[PDB]
Design an enzyme around this catalytic site. Sequence first.
Site, PDB file in Angstrom:
ATOM      1  N   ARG A 179       0.849  -1.192   0.000  1.00 44.41           N
ATOM      2  CA  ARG A 179       0.000   0.000   0.000  1.00 44.41           C
ATOM      3  C   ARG A 179       0.885   1.243   0.000  1.00 44.41           C
ATOM      4  O   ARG A 179       1.826   1.329   0.792  1.00 44.41           O
ATOM      5  CB  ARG A 179      -0.918   0.007   1.223  1.00 44.41           C
ATOM      6  CG  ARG A 179      -2.013  -1.052   1.175  1.00 44.41           C
ATOM      7  CD  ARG A 179      -3.015  -0.852   2.301  1.00 44.41           C
ATOM      8  NE  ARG A 179      -4.311  -1.442   1.949  1.00 44.41           N
ATOM      9  CZ  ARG A 179      -4.672  -2.688   2.241  1.00 44.41           C
ATOM     10  NH1 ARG A 179      -3.853  -3.477   2.922  1.00 44.41           N
ATOM     11  NH2 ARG A 179      -5.859  -3.144   1.865  1.00 44.41           N
TER      12      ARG A 179
ATOM     13  N   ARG B 270      -8.144  -5.913  -4.264  1.00 47.99           N
ATOM     14  CA  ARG B 270      -7.151  -4.893  -4.588  1.00 47.99           C
ATOM     15  C   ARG B 270      -7.162  -4.482  -6.057  1.00 47.99           C
ATOM     16  O   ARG B 270      -6.659  -3.407  -6.406  1.00 47.99           O
ATOM     17  CB  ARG B 270      -5.754  -5.340  -4.148  1.00 47.99           C
ATOM     18  CG  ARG B 270      -5.593  -5.445  -2.636  1.00 47.99           C
ATOM     19  CD  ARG B 270      -5.623  -4.088  -1.948  1.00 47.99           C
ATOM     20  NE  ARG B 270      -4.450  -3.271  -2.274  1.00 47.99           N
ATOM     21  CZ  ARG B 270      -3.234  -3.445  -1.750  1.00 47.99           C
ATOM     22  NH1 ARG B 270      -3.005  -4.410  -0.866  1.00 47.99           N
ATOM     23  NH2 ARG B 270      -2.237  -2.651  -2.123  1.00 47.99           N
TER      24      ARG B 270
HETATM   25  N1  LIG Z   1      -6.687  -5.848   2.371  1.00 49.64           N
HETATM   26  C1  LIG Z   1      -6.817  -6.462   3.574  1.00 49.64           C
HETATM   27  C2  LIG Z   1      -8.086  -6.676   4.107  1.00 49.64           C
HETATM   28  C3  LIG Z   1      -8.198  -7.314   5.337  1.00 49.64           C
HETATM   29  N2  LIG Z   1      -7.091  -7.712   5.981  1.00 49.64           N
HETATM   30  C4  LIG Z   1      -5.862  -7.482   5.449  1.00 49.64           C
HETATM   31  O1  LIG Z   1      -4.846  -7.849   6.084  1.00 49.64           O
HETATM   32  N3  LIG Z   1      -5.732  -6.864   4.258  1.00 49.64           N
END
Ligand SMILES: Nc1ccnc(=O)[nH]1
Lengths: 251, 251, 251, 251, 248, 253
Positions: free
Chosen positions: F167, F222
Amino acid sequence: KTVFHLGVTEADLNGATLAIIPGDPARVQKIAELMDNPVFLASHREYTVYRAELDGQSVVVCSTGIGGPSTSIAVEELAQLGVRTFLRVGTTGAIQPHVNVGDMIVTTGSVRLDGASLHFAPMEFPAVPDFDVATAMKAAAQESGATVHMGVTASSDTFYPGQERYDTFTGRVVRRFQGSMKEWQDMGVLNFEMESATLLTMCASSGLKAGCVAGVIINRTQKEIPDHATLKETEARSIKVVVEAARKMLK
Amino acid sequence: KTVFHLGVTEADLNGATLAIIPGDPARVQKIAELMDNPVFLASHREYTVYRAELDGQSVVVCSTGIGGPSTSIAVEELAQLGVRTFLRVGTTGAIQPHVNVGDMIVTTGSVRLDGASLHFAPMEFPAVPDFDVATAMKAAAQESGATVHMGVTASSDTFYPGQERYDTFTGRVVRRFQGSMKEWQDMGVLNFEMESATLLTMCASSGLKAGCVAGVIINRTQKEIPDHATLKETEARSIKVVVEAARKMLK
Amino acid sequence: KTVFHLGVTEADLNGATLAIIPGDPARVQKIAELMDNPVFLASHREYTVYRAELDGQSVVVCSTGIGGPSTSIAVEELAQLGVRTFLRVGTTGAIQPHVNVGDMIVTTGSVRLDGASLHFAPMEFPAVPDFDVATAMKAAAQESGATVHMGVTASSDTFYPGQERYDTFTGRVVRRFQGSMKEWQDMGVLNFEMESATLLTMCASSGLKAGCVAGVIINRTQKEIPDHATLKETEARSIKVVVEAARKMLK
Amino acid sequence: KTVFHLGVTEADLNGATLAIIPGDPARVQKIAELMDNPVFLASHREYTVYRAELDGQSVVVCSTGIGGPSTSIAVEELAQLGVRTFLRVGTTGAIQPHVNVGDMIVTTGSVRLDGASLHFAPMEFPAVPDFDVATAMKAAAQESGATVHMGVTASSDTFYPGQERYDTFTGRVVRRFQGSMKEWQDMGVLNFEMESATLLTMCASSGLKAGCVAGVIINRTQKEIPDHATLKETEARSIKVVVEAARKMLK
Amino acid sequence: KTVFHLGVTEADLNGATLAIIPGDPARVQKIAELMDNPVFLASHREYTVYRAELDGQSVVVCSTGIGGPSTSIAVEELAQLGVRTFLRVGTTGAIQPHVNVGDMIVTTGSVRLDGASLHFAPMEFPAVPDFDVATAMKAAAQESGATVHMGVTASSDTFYPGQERYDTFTGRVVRRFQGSMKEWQDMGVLNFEMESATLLTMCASSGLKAGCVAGVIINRTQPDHATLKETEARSIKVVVEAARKMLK
Amino acid sequence: MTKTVFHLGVTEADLNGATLAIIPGDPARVQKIAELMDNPVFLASHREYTVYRAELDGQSVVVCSTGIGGPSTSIAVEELAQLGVRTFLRVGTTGAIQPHVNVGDMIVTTGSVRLDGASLHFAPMEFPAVPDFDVATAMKAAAQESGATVHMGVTASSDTFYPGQERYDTFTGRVVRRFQGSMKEWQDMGVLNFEMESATLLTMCASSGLKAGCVAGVIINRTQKEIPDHATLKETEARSIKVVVEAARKMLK
Ligand SMILES: Nc1ccnc(=O)[nH]1
Ligand SMILES: Nc1ccn([C@@H]2O[C@H](CO)[C@@H](O)[C@H]2O)c(=O)n1
Ligand SMILES: Nc1ccn([C@@H]2O[C@H](CO)[C@@H](O)[C@H]2O)c(=O)n1
Ligand SMILES: Nc1ccnc(=O)[nH]1
Ligand SMILES: Nc1ccnc(=O)[nH]1
Ligand SMILES: Nc1ccnc(=O)[nH]1
Ligand SMILES: Nc1ccnc(=O)[nH]1
Ligand SMILES: Nc1ccnc(=O)[nH]1
Ligand code: NA
Ligand code: NA
Ligand code: NA
């Protein structure tokens, strides 16, 4: 087209998308002959390649030789020719007292004591089988009537020091591997072999489905020698099991 | 009394303390026939073993298969039976523009891109040949009339990603090996192969004498494709050279 | 164009492409005086630089100080000024019981127990000498009448814990180095010193030719601290040999 | 009685428990003369040793040479002779735009880009100064009228590739160090030097008190060439500061 | 802008640029109440967040939970909301015989036996506090009357094997950590805890100011309930005074 | 049955013979899981550890929160193991990194990429972060039987939420060299998702003779720049806990 090492073309495989991959070139014909219309394709170096038919579908049988490096070549070249599913079979020695000769082990993950796995994924990546293949192998092993163990396999680039053997020319084991067998025993590791870390890591990181099944023919913790009949039966059972696991994988 | 994989006894070797170790089982008889009274001893898996005589002394010829793991078994088991000197012969892919097809390379040290070397010594240990062996290989190579290069060899557990090949099933190379060919080129590395790091590290840390000599069959930097006749004569020259190097070690 | 540390120019070196590189600045004049027309060039920090003539050809003698870091500066700055061949001479502690005080060692490969080597090549790369330099050093050493050993050298960033010395302020050795001397001994390592890993790795990866010869001043199987009495004779014979090795390297 | 490299005895030190340790042998006398009754003790290799008196108490001044390896020898041998507190003074290249030539830096921790630190403690251990020494150095620096910066120092086994210099013989920087200067800059690192990681790790893990103070001689972000006058004052101020820091450490 | 885990906005902090960061959410109110106008902001998961005023300036108190991973989230999200200075407080066990219950430890550097630190800087980077914060913590700890130790802290991702505890389910400690307590003892390490390597490495490499102070409540080599409660009360009085010294 | 463990503040007797634990991350989720079973009772709350007991088909089951990350998880697992727990079922939220996975889908981990530190306190890096096969099988079945879309595969398990999951919308906007390009690398290697506890849990258990597995509901993808919906996140969490309770049912017989 003709791959570099295997000496076969995509046409030779007759649409096969699944391979059974034993280590020993001499075992290839034996596995192929458990299926329909076995056909010899090629033999070069440690790579003996057959085709056969299972429930009317083409299957490849191809030896790997010993170790991750020779295995990685066979897997890559078979993938180039359209193979997507790889079923490893062999016989192995156990390091747990509760695992008996004649039992079968299906690897749920491998300790990466190899080098070739790192050519596909960094060490943090898990050497794990495809879930469908592992499920098929468990089902086939159990249906054969054998006692089956699901668990972790230590996968070593050596037969001797990496498996903490001291009965060798030098009698020396490098620091890294001193006390390692007891450590893996205490961690519940079932057995040593020499190809699964490479195979599982390469496939799990490359969009290929792989699994490992093995018959137990010796136990490092047991003094008693298993009889000749038990060894024969176990080797026979292991290849019958991998073929039925292949049956379960076919679509 | 009979070693686990090779299937031979100390008596079978007739006092041999030197072995020539090619990769390919099919090359064993070809090397052995350059010497006197060649006799087949055993074949199991990738291990084909012959004995012969050179200037009245017994010599062993034993294939290794592809990769460090299978090589480490052959070396250990021969050492158990009295072999102390190991001469590796093969063919190889050059990565330097000035190295031509038909040239010979004698490895002075190996980049350890393997796993089995670490089962004998930590990474900081140098993968280096015995000096007498490297000297004898250089002399034998020069005496054959070919142009000889002494230098560093990159020794990889894979044929594909570890030699930064992209024409593959996935077309990907793990971070570790991205840009690696150019890196080795700039560092003066001569060639890629797959067994020397294991062989040299194991022997140099175990009181065994080892060396590696190879004929160049391809060049990764040249688009020109070598003649069939060049390939043939390079193969024949490679094994003539290794036998002459053996002769020099026995004197 | 004066280099940052050494305080000399290319013109100062009078066309020299070969340097002899001892550790001790006070040793430079002694080596230069074994040759013809020695000329003092500069002295700054641990770097004393002389020029001389050997069979009519210009040669540089430049001290390195103790350790890879100071050595790396000298080699780089000499290379900037046209030097291509580097002959290291020094003292060393033997770890093999059969190697005697007064013997000479020519390094075939170094165990990289340093940090500076990693600033030139990753740990997998072999700390290997140029074959011609190692050949010249062996020839010079044997011709002198000395007892000469060819083999692997452990090259440490410390004199004390990294060479597993216990007669120290703390009397402690970090885990990594506990039992390390015995490990190297079992692996056939000949000796300990402190610059070869940096020198050989830097040069072999940078297109420079290097080698190392060393006189044994202590045997570590029996003692930790060298005595000053036997030091002087061993040093005198060591520098005669390196000069003869330089003679053999001239074109 | 007499330490091997430094060539001094405990009696020579007249009860000194504190040492000032510059890099350059020629700086030793210059530091010693800022105190009372300076007396030359010995000079061997890069180690020039003086004794002096500060507010009635004996103090040792001893050069280290360049790099962790030579530094570790001096520190160890002085510790054998009763020295418990070590004050490093030296030159440094700043990598932050806001740090000017003439400024002073007191290291609060070092990036371990060395090898010798690992001979005392594993990489996880912090290369940190004694808090009292760092405090005394800050106060001494401020009291001299210098602009002082507290922060992290990158401590490299090389002057060239480990500090990402490209104006070199090869013009190459190994993978590890490509883009490393910008990385340390973005992490708030103030400067490069070559001894602190070794010194601070060795002392912090060995019950010795250590700290580092440096004068900025160049800024790697500035194209302006430092004034001759400022560099002279910088060198003068650094040694006045380290002596006043010593004064503060003594009762 | 509400941050992902903490459930607070920049406005909630009323301009605070300094945070006191205990591990235990239950200690948050206790610390806030040592200052003026303490106000509950949010509680989600292990993160309980208060604001208070110290000499007229806003200060945040925010719990971290156990370990580097949960600490790294709190620090990051507080930094998104304008916090630049982080004062870690707790109580700890000592591994040196000379360190007594009731003593205070101010960490000058941490042994990185964690994983999260590596997500900010490679292992070669020092897990070191900001010098001003460490100076303020020493001053506050000493001014309290306590005996203070400045030194190295071993910062472990586990309470059990990474601190070489054998009284466990398996009684096993992985090779890496066998003999490790004695090794740290011989190297002069003062104590074990579980968050400082992550906190210090993250902040030192990210333009944030951080430090750690801890009261000694037990000694792995060697305590009255009255002394124990006193030590816990003293630890948080000390961190608030250290905050006072950091305000500008 | 009478010694109190250090962090969790419970005794063996408090657990009423439970040998199976359900271990969510969030203390607030403990009661929500416990109420899906019979006779739920609050036992203790200390730090991030909230512990309930309940009964499933007449068998005692413990529900215990772990907090975020391997370190806090390792404490809870160890102390529960001291008190007789041998089977550990992890339920949680996750970010998917494969375009074909939808928010609301379920992922059952077949192996974890060990981007944590606590796993190394139990086994060296070479050791696989792998679930117990029976647990992974029961989780798959439970997830399928709920009508959920289930994915079996590799999970990247990170000691950080931010740089270790690559990120960049952070305070520094910087990601250390190790993790630069890492999301694309895991994507190309077929990794399904990111979370923060599985590497520690699976390595600790697989090396300690304990049975463990992980099931997670997808809350973020993502590859899809959608702001998380409230009703969707609530629906995903309810389904996730229904699944893990049914997975425990399957493990008890
Ligand atoms: N993107 C995420 C969502 C939930 N938990 C995580 O560690 N990462
Ligand atoms: N036992 C010994 C004897 C000698 N040496 C060599 O001598 C220098 C330091 O004394 C170093 O430069 C080193 O090369 C050593 O390292 N170990
Ligand atoms: N840019 C710079 C400037 C100075 N130094 C320090 O000075 C010595 C090498 O010149 C070394 O001893 C080192 O401490 C450096 O490393 N880099
Ligand atoms: N056998 C081993 C034990 C510990 N670490 C390793 O890498 N290998
Ligand atoms: N003990 C063993 C038997 C078979 N294969 C192995 O690798 N090891
Ligand atoms: N280990 C490595 C392999 C290939 N290239 C590298 O830079 N490093
Ligand atoms: N390019 C190559 C030719 C031969 N062998 C290899 O390993 N690689
Ligand atoms: N012994 C300990 C006390 C407090 N915290 C720890 O991490 N360890
Ligand atoms: Na093979
Ligand atoms: Na030096
Ligand atoms: Na937590």
